[PDB]
Amino acid sequence: GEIILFSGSNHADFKAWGGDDWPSAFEISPKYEPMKLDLNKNFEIKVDYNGADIVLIFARWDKDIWAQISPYYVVDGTAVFTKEQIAKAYGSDDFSGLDYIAVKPLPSEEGVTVTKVSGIYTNG
Ligand SMILES: OC[C@H]1O[C@@H](O)[C@H](O)[C@@H](O)[C@@H]1O[C@@H]1O[C@H](CO[C@H]2OC[C@@H](O)[C@H](O)[C@H]2O)[C@@H](O[C@@H]2O[C@H](CO[C@H]3OC[C@@H](O)[C@H](O)[C@H]3O)[C@@H](O[C@@H]3O[C@H](CO[C@H]4OC[C@@H](O)[C@H](O)[C@H]4O)[C@@H](O)[C@H](O)[C@H]3O)[C@H](O)[C@H]2O)[C@H](O)[C@H]1O
Numbered sequence: 143g144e145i146i147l148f149s150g151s152n153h154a155d156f157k158a159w160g161g162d163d164w165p166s167a168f169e170i171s172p173k174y175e176p177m178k179l180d181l182n183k184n185f186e187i188k189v190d191y192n193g194a195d196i197v198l199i200f201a202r203w204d205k206d207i208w209a210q211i212s213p214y215y216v217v218d219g220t221a222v223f224t225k226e227q228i229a230k231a232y233g234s235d236d237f238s239g240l241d242y243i244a245v246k247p248l249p250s251e252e253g254v255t256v257t258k259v260s261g262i263y264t265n266g
Contacts, residue, residue: 145178146238156194156251167191167256169244179261181237186214187223190258194250198223199257200232201242207232219257 154167167175168189170177179185179204200209209231213221231236247254 143261145261146258147178147261148256149260150258151255153253153255156247156249158227158249163244164246166246167196167254169242172240172243180263181240184264184266185225186262187255188262189221189223189245189256190219190220190246192219192255192257193252194247194254196221196254197246197248199242199244199246200228200237201244202239202242203241204239208214209233 147170152167154165158166189196189198195212197212201207209228209237211223211227211231214227215222216226225235245256245259
């Protein structure tokens with residue numbers, strides 16, 4: 143409360159599925175990139191975005207998981223994803239082996255722009 147993980151403009155264009163790549167407006171490989179946020183903490187993730195709807199992805203390649211979730215809610219161009227959601231989609235709240243974290247847009251006419259991403263710690 144509060145750990146800034148990104149700021150400034152990032153536009154992503156995405157028309158539909160079934161192509162080559164599904165691009166991200168923001169993404170981390172936590173096995174190689176150092177990361178501020180503590181996953182074992184009880185947390186939420188807030189994203190300031192504009193335009194198309196969005197999803198948050200937590201993925202592990204070797205066990206082949208693709209936890210992908212919608213916002214808990216959205217207010218004033220700010221979405222909110224909780225840990226309860228992520229863990230439920232992931233199958234567990236133990237993220238050892240985690241390969242990939244990303245904010246991705248759904249198929250839209252004219253894409254999305256992310257202005258900021260952050261994390262917050264909570265009192266369970
Ligand atoms: O293990 C290989 C691994 O190596 C890494 O080095 C590499 O970077 C990884 O990309 C790669 O893993 C594969 O990633 C691709 C693409 O992932 C993106 O993010 C990672 C970036 O590196 C990369 O640049 C990006 O392109 C994944 O493909 C996507 O998979 C998701 C979800 O997983 C699907 O397949 C596995 C199965 O268990 C899931 O249930 C299934 O959903 C798909 O997202 C879903 O899309 C559907 C629409 O489906 C469409 O499929 C094909 C299309 O022709 C047809 O029209 C549609 O049916 C929506 O309904 C869902 O909302 C959504 O969840 C993407 O469509 C798909 O591109 C690979 O899964 C992964 O192996």
